[PDB]
């Protein structure tokens, strides 16, 4: 009777944050697949948490089985390191596109709700003051700029999923804009996750989104009250936290003193999900320092 | 000994015209795959022409075998009908991308020269005065406009090929700009090749039907006679000194830049000169319901190539060729 | 050391009652496959009970591994709902026959005991007074009566298994005749096991819904308490001296021969005795919209078995078991 | 535009006689698959006859390709030899059912007309005065009589095809009743087509071997000359106004109703009239070892068809055709 | 963070002794696959011991996943029973070579350290005083002596691994020379590990059965206590600065050099001292029905290793361990 | 009715000579598979010659279909170039063993006669005076000498075939000893058939390039004219009353027993007699760089009714004659 949520790549930034919220705030069962459990801590001991081992490129039977068993499908496995797009464009395509296509097709076959991570980068060099999921044009560079294979792969997957939507697939696309929070993803981790630049730590701006706001929108998508999220595409970002790299540096140091254009349009996200981001840039970063104080070891790695 | 050219989807516009030039002007052997031969006429009786049967979505072993056998690989099979992009986007992805990828991957495996039909559509809503294959940005609409699945499939394919190029694949991408001539592909033929709009307009003229113009036919296009298209293709296949390896060429005549309305008027005027068409053409009503110029600098310089045919010669050649084959012209839009 | 019994589709009527008997009366290990465990209660907690997850149409490797590991193989997964035969005949074939064949073939490959649920329906419109698994002819209606795809699929599987038997497969076929008891499978559960007619009547009765008597409801059938069914299965699994190898057993009580009408009336009269049912049952009308008696002589002598439960005992047990689980009862037809 | 007919298992009795009619009386194209051509006479020469090599159990790609290419699909490959049903029941299931199913599914996928050889045996031990494809019940013996695996495999294939018909498959099932004529398939040839008893009896006769009658050879059967068989098929393939779509036709001559004893005697009487046969025919004794009328009303009415050849006409044709081909006749039982 | 060691075929001689030493003397994690855990004792309790179920011939996905997950890959599954080489050489090839090749290939793909059990038998009838892994010639009998398919399959695997080493594969081959100790694998267990001749002799001794000496039992061999074997394996798996990468190591004690006859005598003589063995030992008849010294110079010097255990100390160790498990000793030859 | 002989890798030395013998002396049908026909001359125009296209690593369906169709199965496709064993051992294994295994398994399934080219190399460093297929030990070097992956792959295949023989497979193994004749396979052609040492010596001689003599070139070998090799093969394919079923035959002329140096000198002397080769041949020097190999053929002679007729000298003279209007094809032997 309880809703079953399938998270592929659950040891990630998103997976462990989403699992926590689910276990703590609902009666849903979590089916979570990954290779390691190091980001989950105590979640795995929870009686509605069901971790299992597998890789989407290898455990095809075990993955398909859980797609049939579950109600809502989150395939979160994906290469999302900008350095890899340039150096090994083919690895990006093989994992983010080719390895995920069967999982999409299983969600179709078994009539499930596919909640898929598109990308904030899908807009590319779009010039709109606000990136509109229903309206903005999508602009990439020429073929001889291979970094664009990431955006192009994600866009094609969006259109393939949209195509299946035209034939009856219940899907929601979401595009996270620079989610940040405790438990940041490791630079080389194969998951849609956290903002790289913030871990590492100049006038390029981006919209930073505290993870709790991101997760809240996701919960509403999974709950899908009245089927409102079906067929829809949502930017999940805080456009009020549009800060430059210099500003990030300066605020992070000003915050560390206490302890011893790519703007997402989110109108449809707010209205349709009854959602609004609560965390200011300042709140967001304060939260990350409060969290990592003990674990200086986990920070470096 | 002789160079071997594999054409997947040979029974049609590019298949016919390319095979013809190859047989008549080189010692190369042609291996052409398709389901039927009714567009090849007498080419099959030539000793250097090797037609064989197969379908790229079915005959995987027989196709791969030919990729290992041949030197140059041209996979022309694809849905390239604008209406289908909107109504059936999944079928466009499945065939144009998904079913061509194993062919690309065989070309990688056996060290062959992959000569792949990219598309003029890949530039999308590009604002550049000339679409430049080494420089222009590529712009599509949002996900809720599914017609863009074609340009997006074709883009991702160009990038996957580019990624193999970075690992040693010998490839050339070509982007035909509105190739037109005798033996146009039927509107629903799943082959890269001939300008659909010109084909559609020709079918209307000969059936005596109205020609419908969106936004008063303001859309401008660069029209290219097939002989010009083929000559650039020949140079790519020859690949003197490896000059075409790693390259992307628009193959178009930027000097034949006309609006869709100008195209309709010109074809209507031309139809009236021919007694085979005039009477159907008389019945045609033009009814009512932005700039796409190819840069061809690299194409002309690297390949020693220049387009020779004006808009006028192009269309005339077309009307000449169909005059005793009006039934063929009429069936172009069925 | 100990016998390992593999049950595929363990989470239901047969899986539950059998497993229980195995755990309480033998030293055998039970390996049970299904998607959920809600029909197994605390059985999973027992050290000789090994539940594992999978679907026969998906987990090919995991199922075959278990066929190699275990000694006796009971593949229970099957659409066995009459309504479904008529409306989705292909689903019945795909699951009951096609998805079960690889499992049969692994039992062959690894030299296991295949204990396979055939069906009392295999006899079809047989005219014999007693359905004899070694002698009775098997009669179905024409192709335009798709209801018979179920019996025909099951007959073909029995013949395939028999063909494997000719080549050395150790098999036993069993044909349950309307097994009934606690934990009936709900009507769309895709498992061989419980009498659908008794299950649907129970559901409708507890819901105060009218009952359908097809063709006046004079078709006579034989009803069997689950404990009698299970006792016989236990004998088959133990297979003392190889007595059940190559054999085909009807498991049912021929003395419990009642018509559909008689069943409905009996169940109505019984429900009136219980406080949980009497109110809803009073609201039940019978609505109008030959003999199927099993020979069990070989089953009796070869397995040293005899059914113990009368019709009344059986139905009584069922009503008692559901008194505290009225929602389970209501859900049987959901 | 011309209709394309696909025959899998073309090199034999049906493939030869069907192909000949098609080529002689229509503009349709034949695509015929087999391993050899020795039974096709001079047909291959015909420019509308397209023979190709392959085996339905091996050449999956080449078979699927031709299914997509063609309009009408006749899969004739099947073990149809009564002795093999008994001794090798698994091979019968594997070829007749399991290897034909992917062909049925390709016909579904590509929207083709599947014209499938069901069997006269599907009725089994039916008691009806005439075997009615829309109504007659179907009765086989028990599982311990494996001969029934042929009829049961064929029945299930019919129900699977029927299930696909419910989802939109354009099919016609046909059941030939002992078709006979020149070019009989030898007894161990795996194709549906010719009467094996007639073929075997001819074998013995030409070889001077005794003919065996079982249970006194009293069983009546309907015998059909091949030309009447083909005329029905042609009407099916033509499918005037879609009338054959979703139908099941017995194709036989109910007026040619003869026992096995009578068949032997008539064949022996007839052989004595032929110099080439008489010396061998004299040595044949009938040795004792220890009714099947087709209803053809729907066939006659929907196809506008009537069987024209008497049993006597039919046998005379056969003896005439083999008269200067004694070796071939002897080979029918090898 | 911590090194992950994958052992395929863990429930046996090497598996138990290796996992124990890993858990006690490192912080590494063990991932061990097998069908059962009965040879693992209490090792499964350890938090760094991860038993999982599977068979390399079936659970392809689960095996490949663990190869990607783990750092060092030990595939121990193989028929290594001499009589089976003779009786079923195909089974030996299929398991030892064909079924292990995909495991090797995954180790290549994912960049892992392949630590592979080659065999002392690979030298065959080598005439060298010391079998040198870097220099000794490898000598087998003719094709009509099927016993050599074992050594031939193992040889080819070593050369295939060496080929992948040339391309970057990080491998180490190890060749155990008659490893012996508690927990000997039963004779028909398909795992590389323990000395079959010693296991067979112990089995007969405890069963009061005769011992067979082929050709007087004058064949000499080197015998190695298990702790000495494991110590070398630990160094290989630690692989300090890649010292064992690309290397081939015999792991034997050349000072324990005894004939089969001397082995039998010494085992019987030592059994007399044990009251649990003495009585069955007196019933044993020794009945009539080449030096094999490993060079270990590279093993000693590269790995910092030396065998500590004398032959007599090794046999007494074995006799002590089986003292309270006579059942287990007797099951060795079943 | 007529016997059907399947030759996989028909466009080369054995394919050509065998196909010719079959067409001229029997009523058998030849089904030959390759990528090209340029080594087949006129043969394809013959009504009992059926050439078809395919590659054993790719056209699995089309190859298996032909195995089922035909009666006798000759899979000739294999890397057999000594330099490639050392440079690319994996490719040798993959083609010679792995890609041939399914063909063997099809022959088992469809009850055919598998006639498999094993190799004289299978004996390895055998010390026997005559290499006996039924008795001689098989000796290779260590793992770190990858040249031995060829002999080891071919040995394992012979043992897998033998194992299927034990369960009923109709097989014959044949081991050519230095078959030499017109139409030599170039040294990089992936086919069993011709002596590489003779082929490379010819190639270098006609190109006026040095010839290498490994370890002084003292090792003696047996050299067999192709006609003698084909005569034995024909008897195997006919297989009258199953004489060849389950058997292993060396096919060589042990009377043509000459050292590698003797071969060089003999070829150089022969080259000097032909105007097309003489100028090139004068330029060749022998380069030394840092064990007899006699086939026993008693079973082959007595079982098959066979004996080699051609001397070393006739054999090489026939080769030199054949190539003299085809100098470019001789030079290509080592390209
Ligand atoms: Cl870039
Ligand atoms: Cl805010
Ligand atoms: Cl659109
Ligand atoms: Cl111009
Ligand atoms: Cl029905
Ligand atoms: Cl009773
Ligand atoms: Cl029978
Ligand atoms: Cl009549
Ligand atoms: Cl042996
Ligand atoms: Cl010592
Ligand atoms: Cl070497
Ligand atoms: Cl001689």
Tab-separated table of C-alpha atoms in Angstrom, chain A residues 38-278:
chain	number	residue	atom	x	y	z
A	38	UNK	CA	29.397	5.681	2.824
A	39	UNK	CA	27.148	8.742	2.313
A	40	UNK	CA	24.078	7.115	3.867
A	41	UNK	CA	25.332	6.534	7.432
A	42	UNK	CA	22.463	5.355	9.556
A	43	UNK	CA	19.729	5.576	6.906
A	44	UNK	CA	20.419	1.938	5.895
A	45	UNK	CA	19.377	0.677	9.327
A	46	UNK	CA	15.931	2.331	8.972
A	47	UNK	CA	13.163	-0.261	8.438
A	48	UNK	CA	11.677	1.519	5.409
A	49	UNK	CA	15.128	1.834	3.781
A	50	UNK	CA	16.146	-0.944	1.369
A	51	UNK	CA	19.650	-0.549	0.069
A	52	UNK	CA	20.796	-2.933	-2.657
A	53	UNK	CA	23.977	-3.268	-4.671
A	54	UNK	CA	24.168	-2.903	-8.427
A	55	UNK	CA	25.457	-0.860	-11.313
A	56	UNK	CA	23.051	0.321	-14.067
A	57	UNK	CA	25.586	-0.725	-16.747
A	58	UNK	CA	25.760	-4.273	-15.433
A	59	UNK	CA	22.895	-5.391	-13.190
A	60	UNK	CA	20.235	-5.075	-15.862
A	61	UNK	CA	17.917	-7.800	-14.478
A	62	UNK	CA	18.054	-6.544	-10.923
A	63	UNK	CA	17.404	-2.940	-12.082
A	64	UNK	CA	14.479	-3.926	-14.316
A	65	UNK	CA	12.992	-5.966	-11.490
A	66	UNK	CA	12.958	-2.968	-9.108
A	67	UNK	CA	11.457	-0.728	-11.808
A	68	UNK	CA	8.526	-3.150	-12.061
A	69	UNK	CA	8.255	-3.387	-8.267
A	70	UNK	CA	8.415	0.387	-7.509
A	71	UNK	CA	6.023	3.283	-8.225
A	72	UNK	CA	8.368	6.199	-8.831
A	73	UNK	CA	11.700	5.891	-10.670
A	74	UNK	CA	14.677	8.279	-10.058
A	75	UNK	CA	17.659	7.332	-12.240
A	76	UNK	CA	20.313	9.577	-10.716
A	77	UNK	CA	23.453	7.915	-12.203
A	78	UNK	CA	25.290	10.281	-14.563
A	79	UNK	CA	28.743	11.742	-15.230
A	80	UNK	CA	28.496	15.442	-14.350
A	81	UNK	CA	32.133	16.651	-14.196
A	82	UNK	CA	32.789	19.506	-16.731
A	83	UNK	CA	36.432	18.359	-17.106
A	84	UNK	CA	35.308	14.882	-18.378
A	85	UNK	CA	32.947	16.333	-21.048
A	86	UNK	CA	35.975	17.907	-22.842
A	87	UNK	CA	38.458	15.040	-22.323
A	88	UNK	CA	36.243	11.940	-22.749
A	89	UNK	CA	33.050	13.073	-24.466
A	90	UNK	CA	32.139	9.454	-25.309
A	91	UNK	CA	32.069	8.333	-21.670
A	92	UNK	CA	29.514	11.085	-20.964
A	93	UNK	CA	27.211	9.902	-23.776
A	94	UNK	CA	27.534	6.185	-22.884
A	95	UNK	CA	26.560	6.702	-19.241
A	96	UNK	CA	24.145	9.688	-19.142
A	97	UNK	CA	22.343	8.714	-22.317
A	98	UNK	CA	22.913	5.110	-23.476
A	99	UNK	CA	22.952	3.434	-20.016
A	100	UNK	CA	19.807	5.316	-18.908
A	101	UNK	CA	17.656	4.696	-21.954
A	102	UNK	CA	16.768	1.090	-20.945
A	103	UNK	CA	15.621	2.326	-17.509
A	104	UNK	CA	13.411	4.919	-19.148
A	105	UNK	CA	11.969	2.182	-21.408
A	106	UNK	CA	11.258	-0.082	-18.387
A	107	UNK	CA	9.441	2.796	-16.681
A	108	UNK	CA	7.328	3.027	-19.834
A	109	UNK	CA	6.744	-0.721	-20.038
A	110	UNK	CA	5.603	-1.045	-16.395
A	111	UNK	CA	3.590	2.207	-16.332
A	112	UNK	CA	5.664	3.969	-13.640
A	113	UNK	CA	6.263	7.597	-12.737
A	114	UNK	CA	9.648	8.556	-14.149
A	115	UNK	CA	11.194	11.493	-12.301
A	116	UNK	CA	14.307	12.209	-14.323
A	117	UNK	CA	17.234	14.553	-13.670
A	118	UNK	CA	17.603	16.818	-16.749
A	119	UNK	CA	20.275	19.571	-16.312
A	120	UNK	CA	20.477	23.350	-15.725
A	121	UNK	CA	23.037	23.272	-18.570
A	122	UNK	CA	20.407	22.200	-21.128
A	123	UNK	CA	19.753	25.897	-21.850
A	124	UNK	CA	23.405	26.412	-22.882
A	125	UNK	CA	24.088	29.922	-24.178
A	126	UNK	CA	20.401	30.986	-23.951
A	127	UNK	CA	20.088	34.769	-23.661
A	128	UNK	CA	16.756	35.028	-21.826
A	129	UNK	CA	16.952	36.907	-18.567
A	130	UNK	CA	15.174	33.874	-17.135
A	131	UNK	CA	15.567	30.241	-18.310
A	132	UNK	CA	12.020	29.119	-19.107
A	133	UNK	CA	11.500	25.290	-19.237
A	134	UNK	CA	8.432	25.723	-21.515
A	135	UNK	CA	9.716	28.519	-23.769
A	136	UNK	CA	13.518	29.168	-23.795
A	137	UNK	CA	15.625	28.210	-26.794
A	138	UNK	CA	18.565	25.862	-26.203
A	139	UNK	CA	21.940	26.963	-27.629
A	140	UNK	CA	25.256	25.016	-27.768
A	141	UNK	CA	28.546	25.612	-29.568
A	142	UNK	CA	29.733	23.848	-32.744
A	143	UNK	CA	30.578	20.143	-32.954
A	144	UNK	CA	34.298	21.028	-32.470
A	145	UNK	CA	33.496	22.099	-28.889
A	146	UNK	CA	33.011	18.610	-27.382
A	147	UNK	CA	32.036	19.841	-23.863
A	148	UNK	CA	28.567	20.341	-25.314
A	149	UNK	CA	28.027	16.543	-25.628
A	150	UNK	CA	26.809	16.629	-22.001
A	151	UNK	CA	24.072	19.240	-22.715
A	152	UNK	CA	23.239	17.639	-26.028
A	153	UNK	CA	22.954	14.112	-24.496
A	154	UNK	CA	20.674	15.405	-21.716
A	155	UNK	CA	18.543	17.365	-24.203
A	156	UNK	CA	18.066	14.315	-26.460
A	157	UNK	CA	17.128	12.214	-23.418
A	158	UNK	CA	14.585	14.937	-22.491
A	159	UNK	CA	13.042	14.717	-25.975
A	160	UNK	CA	13.011	10.922	-25.951
A	161	UNK	CA	11.249	11.007	-22.552
A	162	UNK	CA	8.863	13.700	-23.933
A	163	UNK	CA	8.179	11.426	-26.933
A	164	UNK	CA	7.201	8.589	-24.579
A	165	UNK	CA	5.103	11.105	-22.656
A	166	UNK	CA	3.168	11.682	-25.913
A	167	UNK	CA	2.343	7.977	-25.871
A	168	UNK	CA	1.302	7.839	-22.211
A	169	UNK	CA	4.440	7.863	-20.019
A	170	UNK	CA	3.933	9.496	-16.660
A	171	UNK	CA	7.124	11.566	-16.335
A	172	UNK	CA	8.464	14.695	-14.655
A	173	UNK	CA	11.737	16.329	-15.706
A	174	UNK	CA	13.647	18.352	-13.145
A	175	UNK	CA	16.666	20.636	-13.571
A	176	UNK	CA	18.681	21.369	-10.390
A	177	UNK	CA	20.526	24.682	-10.337
A	178	UNK	CA	23.666	24.390	-8.210
A	179	UNK	CA	22.277	22.556	-5.196
A	180	UNK	CA	24.608	22.864	-2.224
A	181	UNK	CA	24.503	21.551	1.334
A	182	UNK	CA	26.024	19.047	3.766
A	183	UNK	CA	27.425	15.842	2.214
A	184	UNK	CA	28.788	17.424	-0.982
A	185	UNK	CA	29.519	15.042	-3.905
A	186	UNK	CA	33.137	14.046	-4.642
A	187	UNK	CA	34.507	15.737	-7.827
A	188	UNK	CA	34.623	12.419	-9.791
A	189	UNK	CA	31.313	10.851	-8.568
A	190	UNK	CA	28.926	9.499	-11.373
A	191	UNK	CA	25.784	11.263	-10.064
A	192	UNK	CA	23.735	14.373	-10.665
A	193	UNK	CA	24.482	16.181	-7.407
A	194	UNK	CA	26.157	19.215	-5.936
A	195	UNK	CA	27.925	22.346	-7.203
A	196	UNK	CA	31.646	21.615	-7.822
A	197	UNK	CA	32.912	25.191	-7.248
A	198	UNK	CA	31.564	25.363	-3.678
A	199	UNK	CA	33.431	22.201	-2.591
A	200	UNK	CA	36.764	23.444	-4.034
A	201	UNK	CA	36.502	26.598	-1.889
A	202	UNK	CA	35.598	35.872	-10.790
A	203	UNK	CA	32.449	37.650	-11.931
A	204	UNK	CA	30.525	34.716	-13.499
A	205	UNK	CA	27.217	34.274	-11.637
A	206	UNK	CA	25.114	31.233	-10.978
A	207	UNK	CA	22.000	30.573	-8.878
A	208	UNK	CA	22.851	28.614	-5.753
A	209	UNK	CA	20.164	26.504	-4.187
A	210	UNK	CA	20.222	25.057	-0.684
A	211	UNK	CA	19.632	21.288	-0.793
A	212	UNK	CA	16.594	21.362	1.566
A	213	UNK	CA	14.771	23.630	-0.936
A	214	UNK	CA	15.723	21.296	-3.792
A	215	UNK	CA	14.566	18.202	-1.898
A	216	UNK	CA	11.254	19.920	-0.943
A	217	UNK	CA	10.334	20.432	-4.591
A	218	UNK	CA	11.279	16.791	-5.310
A	219	UNK	CA	8.969	15.537	-2.542
A	220	UNK	CA	6.072	17.456	-4.101
A	221	UNK	CA	6.909	15.944	-7.501
A	222	UNK	CA	6.955	12.432	-6.027
A	223	UNK	CA	3.724	13.062	-4.105
A	224	UNK	CA	2.234	14.432	-7.399
A	225	UNK	CA	-1.008	15.670	-5.787
A	226	UNK	CA	-3.778	15.605	-8.449
A	227	UNK	CA	-1.299	14.509	-11.167
A	228	UNK	CA	-0.099	18.148	-11.429
A	229	UNK	CA	3.569	17.199	-12.075
A	230	UNK	CA	2.732	14.669	-14.836
A	231	UNK	CA	4.162	15.726	-18.232
A	232	UNK	CA	5.936	18.739	-16.634
A	233	UNK	CA	9.486	20.203	-16.615
A	234	UNK	CA	10.706	22.115	-13.489
A	235	UNK	CA	13.781	24.204	-12.847
A	236	UNK	CA	14.609	23.694	-9.178
A	237	UNK	CA	16.713	26.670	-8.170
A	238	UNK	CA	16.772	29.856	-6.107
A	239	UNK	CA	17.055	32.790	-8.557
A	240	UNK	CA	17.569	35.153	-5.564
A	241	UNK	CA	20.911	33.526	-4.802
A	242	UNK	CA	22.574	34.663	-8.069
A	243	UNK	CA	26.113	35.180	-6.866
A	244	UNK	CA	29.492	35.460	-8.565
A	245	UNK	CA	32.596	33.377	-7.765
A	246	UNK	CA	34.242	36.430	-6.105
A	247	UNK	CA	31.114	36.831	-3.917
A	248	UNK	CA	31.175	33.167	-2.920
A	249	UNK	CA	34.858	33.502	-1.882
A	250	UNK	CA	34.202	36.735	0.070
A	251	UNK	CA	31.073	35.410	1.862
A	252	UNK	CA	32.738	32.060	2.696
A	253	UNK	CA	35.621	33.879	4.365
A	254	UNK	CA	33.254	36.298	6.153
A	255	UNK	CA	31.313	33.225	7.399
A	256	UNK	CA	34.537	31.354	8.396
A	257	UNK	CA	35.233	34.459	10.556
A	258	UNK	CA	32.407	33.358	12.893
A	259	UNK	CA	33.676	29.784	13.515
A	260	UNK	CA	36.867	28.821	15.462
A	261	UNK	CA	23.585	35.093	-16.793
A	262	UNK	CA	21.967	31.760	-15.869
A	263	UNK	CA	18.899	32.596	-13.757
A	264	UNK	CA	16.255	29.801	-13.481
A	265	UNK	CA	12.620	30.739	-14.109
A	266	UNK	CA	10.654	28.911	-11.370
A	267	UNK	CA	7.092	30.250	-11.736
A	268	UNK	CA	5.581	26.922	-12.762
A	269	UNK	CA	7.643	25.093	-10.118
A	270	UNK	CA	6.346	27.446	-7.389
A	271	UNK	CA	2.689	27.480	-8.500
A	272	UNK	CA	2.236	23.871	-9.493
A	273	UNK	CA	4.043	22.350	-6.495
A	274	UNK	CA	3.072	24.940	-3.867
A	275	UNK	CA	6.775	25.534	-3.385
A	276	UNK	CA	9.154	28.415	-2.714
A	277	UNK	CA	12.845	28.301	-1.736
A	278	UNK	CA	13.356	29.333	1.927
